[PDB]
Design a binder for this molecule. Structure first.
Ligand SMILES: Cc1cc2nc3c(=O)[nH]c(=O)nc-3n(C[C@H](O)[C@H](O)[C@H](O)COP(=O)(O)OP(=O)(O)OC[C@H]3O[C@@H](n4cnc5c(N)ncnc54)[C@H](O)[C@@H]3O)c2cc1C
Ligand code: SF4
Lengths: 117, 117
């Protein structure tokens, strides 16, 4: 957590806590193994012209309270999404990742034999 | 009573003398009033809007804290009614102590009868 990495954002602390939980659990079985990152195939040639056939849909903006009543109250400045807003925003994803990831056998052996991608 | 409606009030002839007056005989009709408030209301933009109990609690605590922070000690007066029970009055005194004020008073008591001096 922040005791090791210094001040950061909260998901960094959560990630460090989960990784340390895994390491401690391995240690409690009698064999300490350190945490290591995985190797994936990544694409860096994607540009705006390659996505020029995608239709454009505006983002679901956040409902923010007026600044006249915000300066005096400790009430919430923003509201959570409704179900219609959530569906409208989630239906806009481009599905960038491989659908075959959880059953692909190439990446299994690539990560098993530690081949650089 | 019958359910949630107060129907009449009678004297207690076993534990006391069993006499009453007009305010004790007929004065409990305000329990059946339809003009009684039901939920806390907060004034925003000059309109009272209903809130939850948690939001009301947070609002009153934070606003008293704001007054204390801006203006210091003894900037809050607690004016009670002598119709409340002893436990209510004790908790009101504790609340006056917690927000750092010594001005606890009542318009009906108005300083006592002077027999204490
Ligand atoms: C003002 C502020 C605003 C922030 N805003 C954001 C934000 O908007 N978004 C975001 O992502 N991150 C934000 N952060 C960062 C985030 O809060 C922290 O990075 C994250 O919570 C780290 O948590 P932690 O577990 O490492 O330690 P902490 O959550 O900081 O502390 C863990 C606990 O350890 C306890 N503790 C300390 N010493 C001892 C001891 N000797 N014995 C026992 N218990 C002890 C403390 O009581 C504390 O409850 C903010 C941080 C601050 C300070
Ligand atoms: S898959 Fe991820 S990066 Fe790609 S459009 Fe959806 S949310 Fe964005």
């Amino acid at each position: 957590g922040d005791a090791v990495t210094g001040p950061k954002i909260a998901i960094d602390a959560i990630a460090q806590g989960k990784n340390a939980a895994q390491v401690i659990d391995s240690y409690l079985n009698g064999c300490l193994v350190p945490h290591a990152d995985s190797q994936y195939f990544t694409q860096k040639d994607i540009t705006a012209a390659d996505l020029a056939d995608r239709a454009k849909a505006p983002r679901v903006s956040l409902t923010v309270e007026d600044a006249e009543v915000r300066n005096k109250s400790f009430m919430q400045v923003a509201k959570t999404f409704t179900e219609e807003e959530a569906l409208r925003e989630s239906k806009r994803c481009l599905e960038c990742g491989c659908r075959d990831y959880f059953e692909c056998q190439l990446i299994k052996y690539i990560q098993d034999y530690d081949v650089s991608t | 009573y019958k359910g949630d409606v107060v129907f009449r009030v009678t004297p207690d002839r076993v534990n006391d003398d069993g006499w009453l007056c007009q305010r004790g005989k007929f004065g409990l009709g305000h329990a059946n009033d339809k003009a009684r408030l039901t939920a806390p209301v907060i004034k925003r933009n000059g309109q009272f809007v209903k809130v939850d109990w948690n939001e009301a609690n947070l609002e009153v605590v934070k606003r008293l804290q704001a007054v204390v922070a801006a203006y210091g000690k003894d900037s809050i007066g607690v004016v009670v009614s002598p119709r409340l029970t002893n436990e209510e009055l004790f908790l009101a005194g504790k609340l006056a102590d917690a927000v750092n004020t010594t001005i606890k008073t009542s318009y009906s008591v108005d300083g006592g009868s002077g027999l204490g001096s």
